[PDB]
Amino acid sequence: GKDRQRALIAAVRHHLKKVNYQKFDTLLAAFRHYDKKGDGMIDKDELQE
Amino acid sequence: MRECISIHVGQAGVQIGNACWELYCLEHGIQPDGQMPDSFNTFFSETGAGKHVPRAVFVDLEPTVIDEVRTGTYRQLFHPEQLITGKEDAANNYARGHYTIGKEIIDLVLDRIRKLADQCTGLQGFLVFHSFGGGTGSGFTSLLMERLSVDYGKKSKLEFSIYPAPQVSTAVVEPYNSILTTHTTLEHSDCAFMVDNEAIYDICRRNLDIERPTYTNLNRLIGQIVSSITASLRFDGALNVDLTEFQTNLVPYPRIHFPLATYAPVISAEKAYHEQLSVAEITNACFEPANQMVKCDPRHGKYMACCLLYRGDVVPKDVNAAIATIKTKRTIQFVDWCPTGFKVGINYQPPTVVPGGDLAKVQRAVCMLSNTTAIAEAWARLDHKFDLMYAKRAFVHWYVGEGMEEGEFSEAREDMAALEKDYEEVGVDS
Amino acid sequence: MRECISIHVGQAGVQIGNACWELYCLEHGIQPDGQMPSDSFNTFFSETGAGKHVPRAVFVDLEPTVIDEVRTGTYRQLFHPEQLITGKEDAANNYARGHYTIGKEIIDLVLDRIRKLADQCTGLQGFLVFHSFGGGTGSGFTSLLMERLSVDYGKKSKLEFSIYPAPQVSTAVVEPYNSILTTHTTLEHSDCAFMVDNEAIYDICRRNLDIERPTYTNLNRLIGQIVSSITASLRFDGALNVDLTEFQTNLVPYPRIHFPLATYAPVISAEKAYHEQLSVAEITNACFEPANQMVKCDPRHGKYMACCLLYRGDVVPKDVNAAIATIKTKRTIQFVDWCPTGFKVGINYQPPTVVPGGDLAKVQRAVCMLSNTTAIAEAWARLDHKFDLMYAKRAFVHWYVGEGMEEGEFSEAREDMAALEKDYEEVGVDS
Amino acid sequence: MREIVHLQAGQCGNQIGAKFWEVISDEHGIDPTGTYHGDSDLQLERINVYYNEATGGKYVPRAVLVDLEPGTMDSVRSGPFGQIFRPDNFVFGQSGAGNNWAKGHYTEGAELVDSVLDVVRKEAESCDCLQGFQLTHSLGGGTGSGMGTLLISKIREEYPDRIMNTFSVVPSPKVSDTVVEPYNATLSVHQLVENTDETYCIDNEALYDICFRTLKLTTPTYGDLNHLVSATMSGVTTCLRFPGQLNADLRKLAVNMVPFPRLHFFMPGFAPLTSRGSQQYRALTVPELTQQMFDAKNMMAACDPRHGRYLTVAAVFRGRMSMKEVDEQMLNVQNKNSSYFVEWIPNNVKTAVCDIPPRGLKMSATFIGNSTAIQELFKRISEQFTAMFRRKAFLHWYTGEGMDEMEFTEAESNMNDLVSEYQQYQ
Amino acid sequence: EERVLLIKPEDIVLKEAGSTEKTLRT
Amino acid sequence: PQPLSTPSWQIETKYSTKVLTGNWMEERRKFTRDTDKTPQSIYRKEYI
Ligand SMILES: Nc1nc2c(ncn2[C@@H]2O[C@H](COP(=O)(O)OP(=O)(O)OP(=O)(O)O)[C@@H](O)[C@H]2O)c(=O)[nH]1
Ligand SMILES: Nc1nc2c(ncn2[C@@H]2O[C@H](COP(=O)(O)OP(=O)(O)OP(=O)(O)O)[C@@H](O)[C@H]2O)c(=O)[nH]1
Ligand SMILES: Nc1nc2c(ncn2[C@@H]2O[C@H](COP(=O)(O)OP(=O)(O)O)[C@@H](O)[C@H]2O)c(=O)[nH]1
Ligand SMILES: [Mg+2]
Ligand SMILES: [Mg+2]
Known part of the structure; x- marks a missing residue:
């Protein structure tokens, strides 16, 4: 009963991987864009936005 | 020091130079304000305030298309006298752009070319973007390139041209202005890359999966070729080419300067990460006829010379192991007088993706400029349509009433008939 | 100077070599790194001038799945990276695939390394070829390797250790086919081919060692003990030393009867050795008991032609000769009339070496026995019976047909083995 | 100095x-x-x-x-x-x-x-x-x-x-x-x-x-x-x-x-090359350098020496070694391969000895060799030149800079004579 | 990226065996 | 004398060196083991 969950997680993860690769040249810039607050950690509202 | 002065003529050259000079802004990291946030010296000149102004000229006879550049995003980048406007267009006629309308503004263009040549401490040549099928792009260009040869004699004059498509065509009297302006492109030109629109229309459909493209989807792929040709002047690499270097390795005779351009890999963003972008599978795409950007088939013709312009993580071992297996295909033919037919240029920098674009971020790319005899198929299908129209003497009063004689029509068919006759004699093996 | 060369072909031979090279390294005190911690090694190892030591063996297989185990194992620092020769697809238990089609693509690489080792050797004494009859690789590759090395080197001894197919337990269905196709060519290009089966070692491990469920590592360690015991006479010094050519002449009285058998003594666990003393007479009689032959056959049916006893450790000729006299006075062992002196003995001053984590006990002496019997004719009769029961209805034939092997060679090999069995009968009968 | x-x-x-x-x-x-x-x-x-x-x-x-x-x-x-x-x-x-x-x-x-x-x-x-x-x-x-x-x-x-x-x-x-x-x-x-x-x-x-x-x-x-x-x-x-x-x-x-002034073309070889994996498992000794030296896979020119004859051979040696094994090894390869040297000059092998080996290596040797097989190098250039000069190809980069078309005529004529001189001395 | 803490010293590994490039721990 | 996995002019799809295909042993190890000192001469070694 978790097949829809696994499919949606896989689709979102692959889409985020390709979007990060196409937008950000490096990985530190991607992390700093994902985390706007500068605390060093990524929160749930940061992830959803 | 090494730098090119780009010339754009017509309504085509403005919309090609809108998407070409977009990439030069993004390749060197140039802000739309004009400042960095010495490879940029090839195009962007320095100033004591720290801003960079391009070394380009935009010419048209209508102010309709240049006013959008003047009131667009890039209004602060282009110099106020590097965007010259005429009051009235040439209106799809050769004679208007060559004698009446195109003569009133040639004195203004010559002064600006003379300025940008004086700031150039060393100049390699000129690059031209125009349209064969237009009035300004074929009428005004035919007097600029005649006048460029008088002042600057031995300078290189390359050419990126918009040639009529074999089936579709936007203008009725396009075959007149396609035939008549070729004389300027024989004696007063050095290497003439041609690209047409049907040969790019099919590419974006079956590769990029875009069902409905537009001119901005075509201008970026033309804008990707010109950066791959110039990339050896700008950035470091294992083997560097130059405008003196690949003119040496692609034209054997001075009347044959008509190659065919191609580019690979050309795929979308979704398909990229499942395939392997091998060095073999980016040079096997170029030799296929479906990747050709001129609607003609090299299977009918024979290659004379070729050039390969690599970018990115390319090993010279991979180039030679892929060239060696190319030579064993029976489908690709060569003339017997060119046993060594390849030139290899390696540049370190991988291509840069534009935001909102269709091409993906790749590590390797190669642009091949191949000379063939099958480009004579393209002119025969255009020489066919000219005499079919000229037999009934149609649309002639638009031409003789503006300032040329009717005797320039007989010269136009007879001059490039020998250029046709030049290709069967050359294509015969020794 | 007296040196031997080793070849390991097929999975069984490769894994037995994997077992035995560790044993040789621990006997000489040599790390898998290759250097001694801080000239009896000259038989097997070669001193690299940097300080390392390398073995004189070539590990070749048509399948990479067992030699990549050696390459990625803890003995990556021992061998030579050009000795390790791989194919791309196995023989799939097919003699024609092992000998005609895929066996021709690597044999030049096989012989070049052997030529290089021969050029490195200041002296050469013989070949040690390790394989099995049952598999297609170990049945086909060894045939063309024997004919090529017989073309190359003429009169060098070729000791050949083969895992013999047991009559009851076996893991293949073309095993009689592979055994017959090996023994077609083994008769004309060999001198000393020793046989080892699986079920006899299984019974020994179940009864003597009290191991209920033994794996292949126990069998491979025991066979490594056998090979170390037989080559100790070439490595170490002894009172009576045995050379390869001389015991080959001892063990081969007729050129077509050259299939001897090997036994080891004593094989006991650690508990029983504390309570029991193992005198020389008891050990050499345990050699002759029916429960200690490492080939499953009935020894009462066949007689003994000639046999050699190679003793390791504190062993003295007084009780050696006394024990031989007791064996001769024992009546149930029957010897042939034409050979009065069928016993040859050699003695070495060095004790056996245990392996840590093993199931073998620590003993002050041991012995390896090599015997020439006529009892293996029953096993070969059983092999011919299963072979012609397949061949009556031409089962499993079209694979060998399609690979490139003809039909009448089956009949030629079958009649050759019939002739060999009749030769066994004709030498068994006495004047 | x-x-x-x-x-x-x-x-x-x-x-x-x-x-x-x-x-x-x-x-x-x-x-x-x-x-x-x-x-x-x-x-x-x-x-x-x-x-x-x-x-x-x-x-x-x-x-x-x-x-x-x-x-x-x-x-x-x-x-x-x-x-x-x-x-x-x-x-x-x-x-x-x-x-x-x-x-x-x-x-x-x-x-x-x-x-x-x-x-x-x-x-x-x-x-x-x-x-x-x-x-x-x-x-x-x-x-x-x-x-x-x-x-x-x-x-x-x-x-x-x-x-x-x-x-x-x-x-x-x-x-x-x-x-x-x-x-x-x-x-x-x-x-x-x-x-x-x-x-x-x-x-x-x-x-x-x-x-x-x-x-x-x-x-x-x-x-x-x-x-x-x-x-x-x-x-x-x-x-x-x-x-x-x-x-x-x-x-x-x-x-x-150099026995004659137009015989001064060589092709060189280098002795100690091995592999990466077998760096420390191969003994490097005077017989091993000589065997690696004379093989055709070690040559730094695209010509097979078996299709021609060595005219004269030079060898320079770096490293501590025995002088007798040097003299014997290149005498044996001179004597066994009798057909691969010309017979009108004796002592075709030259010997030189240095004492310091290169860094991280203990014995090294460089081979300099005049051979007739270097003619094969210049004949493949000649067959591409005749097939392309006959069509007058690419000449406007050459005629238009100050040359006459006969400079290609004399360049092919002398190079055809250099390959003519090697063949008579074979 | 090595200068720019977010990553522990144990997190950096070689990409392959005997290769110059550095990557992260999986 | 050519191994079945020697580098050559044949075009093959290359994976990482972890995968045991083609040539992997030669690429797993490192080239450099190049450390030594200059061991002087015959003349100074002998004449003391
Ligand atoms: N691929 C492509 N083709 C273009 C582009 N812009 C113009 N063209 C071609 O140019 C042709 C029309 O020529 P124009 O440049 O508009 O006309 P002109 O040179 O200004 O001459 P006049 O109209 O008389 O002033 C069209 O048929 C197009 O095929 C472009 O941005 N991309
Ligand atoms: N003692 C012992 N015998 C083995 C071992 N592995 C296989 N055998 C014997 O080998 C016989 C079958 O041949 P295999 O070794 O499996 O196959 P092969 O000889 O390598 O030939 P291929 O299958 O083509 O690779 C079996 O009957 C076993 O008795 C082992 O590890 N130890
Ligand atoms: N082996 C090797 N070949 C080189 C090197 N540099 C250039 N080449 C070769 O030289 C050729 C190009 O020479 P080129 O640059 O035109 O010579 P130049 O114009 O006189 O400077 C290429 O085909 C390369 O194969 C190098 O460092 N090593
Ligand atoms: Mg216009
Ligand atoms: Mg196997």
């Missing part, structure tokens, strides 16, 4: 000289700063041969770095060793040669020589007793083939009695990279066969063969090919700078390999 003045021209000569000046900086114990960091006194004893003394104990190379294009002098100055080359020894033009021999020999290559000829005259008179010269260039290019071979004509006329040994990069049918190389390859051979003393023909395809088969590396680069070429270049003058038992200069390699 006696010094070698290195010359490098073009793009290929700069990159070869980038790697050549790296290992003799390694062997003499020279840091990238310029000072001396060594452990033995033998390395400083004869260091004036290549390195010139200056203030602060700083040693600079005695080499010029010449090209018509500044695209490669910027990179070689920004390499790991770019600080040590003197800025007055970078002569540069502003316009590239463009793969034309005419641009580099009459128009652009005929003007920049007067700056190069000035700066080499300041350095030549600074030497006490100059031995000769050495040069690295490319025949397939414009600057090295054009103006590098123009300095061959000019500096030979000014100094007759010197030594001129060259390191040319001949083209290759399989690693072919330029359309008009047959023209700049043929027309430079005519300048080589008269004004040089020895010739060592380096080839591109013969170096990929070594790295694939002998060295076992799947993806080589130019940083690996240049190391093999730079290994020979240090090993050919190895006895001018270190003591030995039977030492030999560049004079004695030329008087033993």
Whole structure:
């Protein structure tokens, strides 16, 4: 009963991987864009936005 | 020091130079304000305030298309006298752009070319973007390139041209202005890359999966070729080419300067990460006829010379192991007088993706400029349509009433008939 | 100077070599790194001038799945990276695939390394070829390797250790086919081919060692003990030393009867050795008991032609000769009339070496026995019976047909083995 | 005492000289700063041969770095060793040669020589007793083939009695990279066969063969090919700078390999190459170097020696060794392969002995060989030239610069005569 | 990226066996 | 004398060196083991 969950997680993860690769040249810039607050950690509202 | 002065003529050259000079802004990291946030010296000149102004000229006879550049995003980048406007267009006629309308503004263009040549401490040549099928792009260009040869004699004059498509065509009297302006492109030109629109229309459909493209989807792929040709002047690499270097390795005779351009890999963003972008599978795409950007088939013709312009993580071992297996295909033919037919240029920098674009971020790319005899198929299908129209003497009063004689029509068919006759004699093996 | 060369072909031979090279390294005190911690090694190892030591063996297989185990194992620092020769697809238990089609693509690489080792050797004494009859690789590759090395080197001894197919337990269905196709060519290009089966070692491990469920590592360690015991006479010094050519002449009285058998003594666990003393007479009689032959056959049916006893450790000729006299006075062992002196003995001053984590006990002496019997004719009769029961209805034939092997060679090999069995009968009968 | 003045021209000569000046900086114990960091006194004893003394104990190379294009002098100055080359020894033009021999020999290559000829005259008179010269260039290019071979004509006329040994990069049918190389390859051979003393023909395809088969590396680069070429270049003058038992200069390699003035083409080989995995598992001994030496897979030219005959053979040895095994090994290969040497000259094998081996290696040996099989190198260039000159191809880059069409006629006629001279001596 | 803490010293590994490039721990 | 996995001119799809295909042993190890000192000469070694 978790097949829809696994499919949606896989689709979102692959889409985020390709979007990060196409937008950000490096990985530190991607992390700093994902985390706007500068605390060093990524929160749930940061992830959803 | 090494730098090119780009010339754009017509309504085509403005919309090609809108998407070409977009990439030069993004390749060197140039802000739309004009400042960095010495490879940029090839195009962007320095100033004591720290801003960079391009070394380009935009010419048209209508102010309709240049006013959008003047009131667009890039209004602060282009110099106020590097965007010259005429009051009235040439209106799809050769004679208007060559004698009446195109003569009133040639004195203004010559002064600006003379300025940008004086700031150039060393100049390699000129690059031209125009349209064969237009009035300004074929009428005004035919007097600029005649006048460029008088002042600057031995300078290189390359050419990126918009040639009529074999089936579709936007203008009725396009075959007149396609035939008549070729004389300027024989004696007063050095290497003439041609690209047409049907040969790019099919590419974006079956590769990029875009069902409905537009001119901005075509201008970026033309804008990707010109950066791959110039990339050896700008950035470091294992083997560097130059405008003196690949003119040496692609034209054997001075009347044959008509190659065919191609580019690979050309795929979308979704398909990229499942395939392997091998060095073999980016040079096997170029030799296929479906990747050709001129609607003609090299299977009918024979290659004379070729050039390969690599970018990115390319090993010279991979180039030679892929060239060696190319030579064993029976489908690709060569003339017997060119046993060594390849030139290899390696540049370190991988291509840069534009935001909102269709091409993906790749590590390797190669642009091949191949000379063939099958480009004579393209002119025969255009020489066919000219005499079919000229037999009934149609649309002639638009031409003789503006300032040329009717005797320039007989010269136009007879001059490039020998250029046709030049290709069967050359294509015969020794 | 007296040196031997080793070849390991097929999975069984490769894994037995994997077992035995560790044993040789621990006997000489040599790390898998290759250097001694801080000239009896000259038989097997070669001193690299940097300080390392390398073995004189070539590990070749048509399948990479067992030699990549050696390459990625803890003995990556021992061998030579050009000795390790791989194919791309196995023989799939097919003699024609092992000998005609895929066996021709690597044999030049096989012989070049052997030529290089021969050029490195200041002296050469013989070949040690390790394989099995049952598999297609170990049945086909060894045939063309024997004919090529017989073309190359003429009169060098070729000791050949083969895992013999047991009559009851076996893991293949073309095993009689592979055994017959090996023994077609083994008769004309060999001198000393020793046989080892699986079920006899299984019974020994179940009864003597009290191991209920033994794996292949126990069998491979025991066979490594056998090979170390037989080559100790070439490595170490002894009172009576045995050379390869001389015991080959001892063990081969007729050129077509050259299939001897090997036994080891004593094989006991650690508990029983504390309570029991193992005198020389008891050990050499345990050699002759029916429960200690490492080939499953009935020894009462066949007689003994000639046999050699190679003793390791504190062993003295007084009780050696006394024990031989007791064996001769024992009546149930029957010897042939034409050979009065069928016993040859050699003695070495060095004790056996245990392996840590093993199931073998620590003993002050041991012995390896090599015997020439006529009892293996029953096993070969059983092999011919299963072979012609397949061949009556031409089962499993079209694979060998399609690979490139003809039909009448089956009949030629079958009649050759019939002739060999009749030769066994004709030498068994006495004047 | 006696010094070698290195010359490098073009793009290929700069990159070869980038790697050549790296290992003799390694062997003499020279840091990238310029000072001396060594452990033995033998390395400083004869260091004036290549390195010139200056203030602060700083040693600079005695080499010029010449090209018509500044695209490669910027990179070689920004390499790991770019600080040590003197800025007055970078002569540069502003316009590239463009793969034309005419641009580099009459128009652009005929003007920049007067700056190069000035700066080499300041350095030549600074030497006490100059031995000769050495040069690295490319025949397939414009600057090295054009103006590098123009300095061959000019500096030979000014100094007759010197030594001129060259390191040319001949083209290759399989690693072919330029359309008009047959023209700049043929027309430079005519300048080589008269004004040089020895010739060592380096080839591109013969170096990929070594790295694939002998060295076992799947993806080589130019940083690996240049190391093999730079290994020979240090090993050919190895006895001018270190003591030995039977030492030999560049004079004695030329008087033993050249029986006639038009017989001065060689092909070189290097002895110690092995693999990466079997670095420490192979014994390196006098029989092992000799066996690796004479095989056809070790040769640095694209010619098979079995299809021709060796005329004369040179061998120089570096490392501590026994003198008897040296004499016996190349006497056995001379005696067994009786058909692979000509019979009108005895003692075709020359022996030289040095004492210091290269760093991290214990015995090394370089093979210099005059052979008739180098004719096969120049015949494949000739078959491409005739098939393309017959169609008058690409001539407007040559006729329009100041030449007549007969300069190609005389260039093919003399090169057809050089291959005619090798065949009669076979 | 090595200068720019977010990553522990144990997190950096070689990409392959005997290779110059550095990557992260999986 | 050519191994079945020697580098050559044949075009093959290359995976990482972890995967045991083609040539992997030669690429797993490192090239450099190049450390030694200059061991002087016959003349100084002998004449003391
Ligand atoms: N691919 C492509 N083709 C273009 C582009 N802009 C113009 N063209 C071609 O140019 C042709 C029309 O020529 P124009 O440049 O508009 O006309 P002109 O040169 O200004 O001459 P006049 O109209 O008389 O002033 C069209 O048929 C197009 O095919 C462009 O941005 N991309
Ligand atoms: N003692 C012992 N015998 C083995 C071992 N592995 C296989 N055998 C014997 O080998 C016979 C079958 O041949 P295999 O070794 O499996 O196959 P092969 O000889 O390598 O030939 P291929 O299958 O083509 O690779 C079996 O009957 C076993 O008795 C082992 O590890 N130890
Ligand atoms: N082996 C090797 N070949 C080189 C090197 N540099 C250039 N080449 C070869 O030289 C050819 C091009 O020479 P080119 O640059 O035109 O010579 P130039 O014009 O005189 O400077 C190429 O085909 C390369 O294969 C190098 O460092 N090593
Ligand atoms: Mg217009
Ligand atoms: Mg197997």
